């Protein structure tokens, strides 16, 4: 369960955002990608897999997964194959005028989302490190 | 200290790679960026800052840090401003033929680097930051 991520897509301004949610914690990684293709999805996954110990990704199983490229990255990386899209969009719309480019607003929104403290509440960022640390030791 | 990262640049095939190293662990985040500019550097930092609890980034203080945009992102994110290229390049050259694009090889190399094991860098950074949370 600390290894399980959910990958979805979401759309704003005519652009594609991939959102990876670490299910146990609610931590997110998200980025604008230029197109919802196997190759860009596989790149985004390979990046995620290098940064966190990703055991299983649950995806929407759509078009960008029926090909070779995501499967190749997942095999290589040893990965087995929302309210969150809505929340992220909400945060993006609060910071959107601060940045010219959507991608910057996305990463501000990821920062906000992951560091927000919902109380001695923990943020998503603290939750994910604590869940994985606990799993390691 | 758990919040301290070092940001360097490295070059391969005419492309720019930014490498952020979490100094206490050796964990890296690296990406190819289109150009060594303030804007692309500030984007890379803003991304890093949303994923890890980055308190200080040590950079090389060069041209992409003299303008506005890195400082605006570090201000926003609350980051203070102030071996590894070689190892990553080594890994990159071992996987390079597996990928058409340099960026893919870079992320394979980051994956190798961070997961290679008796802890890996990826385990070290989470254990260091989890220990910090209290």
């Amino acid at each position: 369960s600390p290894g399980i991520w959910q990958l979805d897509c979401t759309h704003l301004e005519g652009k594609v955002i991939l959102v990876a949610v670490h299910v146990a914690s609610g931590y997110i990684e998200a980025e604008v990608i230029p197109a919802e293709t196997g190759q860009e999805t596989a790149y985004f996954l390979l990046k995620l897999a290098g940064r966190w110990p990703v055991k299983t990704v649950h995806t929407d199983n759509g078009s960008n997964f029926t090909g070779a490229t995501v499967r190749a990255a997942c095999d290589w990386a040893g990965i087995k194959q929302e309210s969150m899209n809505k929340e992220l969009k909400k945060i993006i719309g609060q910071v959107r005028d601060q940045a010219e480019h959507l991608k910057t607003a996305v990463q501000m929104a990821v920062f906000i989302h992951n560091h927000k403290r919902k109380g001695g509440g923990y943020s998503a960022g603290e939750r994910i490190v604590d869940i994985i640390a606990t799993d390691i030791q | 200290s758990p919040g301290i990262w070092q940001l360097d640049c490295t070059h391969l095939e005419g492309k720019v790679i930014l490498v952020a190293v979490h100094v206490a662990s050796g964990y890296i985040e690296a990406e190819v960026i289109p150009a060594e500019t303030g804007q692309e550097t500030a984007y890379f930092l803003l991304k890093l800052a949303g994923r890890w609890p980055v308190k200080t980034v040590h950079t090389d203080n060069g041209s992409n840090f003299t303008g506005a945009t890195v400082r605006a992102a570090c201000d926003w994110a609350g980051i203070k401003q102030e071996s590894m290229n070689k190892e990553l390049k080594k890994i990159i050259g071992q996987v390079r033929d597996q990928a058409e694009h340099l960026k893919t090889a870079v992320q394979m190399a980051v994956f190798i680097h961070n997961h290679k094991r008796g802890y890996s860098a990826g385990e070290r950074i989470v254990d260091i930051i989890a220990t910090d949370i209290q």
Binding site: Q39, T69, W76 | A99
Partner: peptide, 6 residues
């Protein structure tokens, strides 16, 4: 024929 392409 590569991981990301062909």
């Amino acid at each position: 024929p590569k991981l990301d392409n062909x």
